[PDB]
Design an enzyme around this catalytic site. Structure first.
Site, PDB file in Angstrom:
ATOM      1  N   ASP A 114      14.659  20.623  49.705  1.00 23.11           N
ATOM      2  CA  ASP A 114      13.674  21.738  49.364  1.00 23.11           C
ATOM      3  C   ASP A 114      14.251  23.090  49.138  1.00 23.11           C
ATOM      4  O   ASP A 114      14.902  23.768  49.865  1.00 23.11           O
ATOM      5  CB  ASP A 114      13.052  21.784  50.953  1.00 23.11           C
ATOM      6  N   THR A 115      14.172  23.325  47.904  1.00 26.62           N
ATOM      7  CA  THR A 115      14.791  24.608  47.271  1.00 26.62           C
ATOM      8  C   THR A 115      13.962  25.977  47.732  1.00 26.62           C
ATOM      9  O   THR A 115      14.402  26.888  47.486  1.00 26.62           O
ATOM     10  CB  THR A 115      14.497  24.581  45.482  1.00 26.62           C
ATOM     11  N   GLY A 116      12.678  25.720  48.127  1.00 28.30           N
ATOM     12  CA  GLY A 116      12.177  26.943  48.737  1.00 28.30           C
ATOM     13  C   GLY A 116      12.504  27.171  50.097  1.00 28.30           C
ATOM     14  O   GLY A 116      11.898  28.012  50.669  1.00 28.30           O
TER      15      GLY A 116
HETATM   16  C1  LIG Z   1      14.581  30.203  56.749  1.00 27.62           C
HETATM   17  O1  LIG Z   1      14.379  28.893  56.487  1.00 27.62           O
HETATM   18  C2  LIG Z   1      13.277  28.048  56.281  1.00 27.62           C
HETATM   19  C3  LIG Z   1      12.060  29.050  56.490  1.00 27.62           C
HETATM   20  C4  LIG Z   1      10.969  28.666  55.987  1.00 27.62           C
HETATM   21  C5  LIG Z   1      10.542  27.341  55.658  1.00 27.62           C
HETATM   22  S1  LIG Z   1       9.149  26.606  55.102  1.00 27.62           S
HETATM   23  O2  LIG Z   1       9.154  25.181  55.350  1.00 27.62           O
HETATM   24  O3  LIG Z   1       8.033  27.421  55.926  1.00 27.62           O
HETATM   25  N1  LIG Z   1       9.211  26.687  53.542  1.00 27.62           N
HETATM   26  C6  LIG Z   1       9.526  28.164  53.097  1.00 27.62           C
HETATM   27  C7  LIG Z   1       8.712  28.704  52.108  1.00 27.62           C
HETATM   28  C8  LIG Z   1       7.284  28.679  52.491  1.00 27.62           C
HETATM   29  C9  LIG Z   1       5.996  29.193  51.394  1.00 27.62           C
HETATM   30  C10 LIG Z   1       6.813  30.605  51.069  1.00 27.62           C
HETATM   31  C11 LIG Z   1       8.384  30.757  50.460  1.00 27.62           C
HETATM   32  C12 LIG Z   1       8.987  30.068  51.646  1.00 27.62           C
HETATM   33  C13 LIG Z   1       9.575  25.648  52.790  1.00 27.62           C
HETATM   34  C14 LIG Z   1       8.484  25.015  51.759  1.00 27.62           C
HETATM   35  O4  LIG Z   1       9.044  24.368  50.964  1.00 27.62           O
HETATM   36  C15 LIG Z   1       7.656  24.378  52.993  1.00 27.62           C
HETATM   37  C16 LIG Z   1       8.106  23.095  53.341  1.00 27.62           C
HETATM   38  C17 LIG Z   1       7.045  22.131  54.063  1.00 27.62           C
HETATM   39  C18 LIG Z   1       6.516  21.115  53.755  1.00 27.62           C
HETATM   40  C19 LIG Z   1       5.389  20.479  54.370  1.00 27.62           C
HETATM   41  C20 LIG Z   1       5.057  20.904  55.957  1.00 27.62           C
HETATM   42  C21 LIG Z   1       5.874  22.044  56.226  1.00 27.62           C
HETATM   43  C22 LIG Z   1       6.702  22.713  55.591  1.00 27.62           C
HETATM   44  N2  LIG Z   1       6.391  23.992  51.932  1.00 27.62           N
HETATM   45  C23 LIG Z   1       5.004  24.341  52.124  1.00 27.62           C
HETATM   46  O5  LIG Z   1       4.939  25.226  52.849  1.00 27.62           O
HETATM   47  C24 LIG Z   1       4.169  23.522  51.420  1.00 27.62           C
HETATM   48  C25 LIG Z   1       4.079  22.140  51.590  1.00 27.62           C
HETATM   49  C26 LIG Z   1       3.053  21.473  51.011  1.00 27.62           C
HETATM   50  C27 LIG Z   1       2.055  21.993  50.436  1.00 27.62           C
HETATM   51  C28 LIG Z   1       2.000  23.238  50.459  1.00 27.62           C
HETATM   52  O6  LIG Z   1       0.849  23.910  49.758  1.00 27.62           O
HETATM   53  C29 LIG Z   1       2.890  24.352  50.846  1.00 27.62           C
HETATM   54  C30 LIG Z   1      11.915  26.448  55.630  1.00 27.62           C
HETATM   55  C31 LIG Z   1      12.957  27.128  55.735  1.00 27.62           C
END
Ligand SMILES: COc1ccc(S(=O)(=O)N(CC2CCCCC2)C[C@@H](O)[C@H](Cc2ccccc2)NC(=O)c2cccc(O)c2)cc1
Lengths: 99, 99
Positions: free
Chosen positions: B25-27
């Protein structure tokens, strides 16, 4: 280009002649943009993230140029913390993960 | 390897006697794993995404094997719906985005 991950993968996108910065997010199924105006009919939708569910507006067949590469697809608009480019459009621009 | 984004980029990770499937997960700035009772010291933290914030436990210097690549770093443990391999460990396995 090739993008390393020591920094957030933020790129400039062009949507409706407006430039915005968006995060390339391989963990996102959908492309989700912060509050903005887009033309056309939208459908209300709900999506889920790490913190629960939010309400968004779904716009279909919207063009976005992501770092010079053209996409036309579904864009969700709502209270995402950051503009994110998800897999639906990452595939369109031929983006892959490599290691 | 090269991973396309037609489907979620899930891979096998190893943390002790637990093999788990996790998203590349690059996000995600940091690595977030579903609840598990890891040994040692930790610090509480809040992390935010779509839907709001969750409470996690931050554990430092945890070795993880990701697709047979070795990594060691910070892991956040809490009530996430999905195991998430963030940029802190992606850079360690040499992961890039390419298009
Ligand atoms: C500080 O470290 C962090 C902080 C935040 C996160 S995060 O997960 O919220 N998150 C961080 C992001 C959140 C949006 C704004 C930028 C920061 C990682 C993201 O890839 C998540 C991963 C995901 C997938 C499925 C269910 C829950 C989460 N995707 C999603 O939120 C997501 C999944 C499927 C469909 C959709 O529409 C969105 C991860 C690590």
């Amino acid at each position: 280009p090739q993008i390393t991950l020591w920094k957030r993968p933020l790129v400039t996108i062009r949507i409706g002649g407006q430039l915005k910065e968006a995060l390339l997010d391989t963990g996102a199924d959908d492309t989700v943009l912060e509050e903005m105006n887009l033309p056309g009919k939208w459908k209300p939708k709900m999506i889920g993230g790490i913190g629960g569910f939010i309400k968004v507006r779904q716009y279909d067949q919207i063009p976005i140029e992501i770092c010079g590469h053209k996409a036309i697809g579904t864009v969700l608009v709502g209270p995402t913390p950051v503009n994110i480019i998800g897999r639906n459009l990452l595939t369109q621009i031929g983006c892959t993960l490599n290691f």
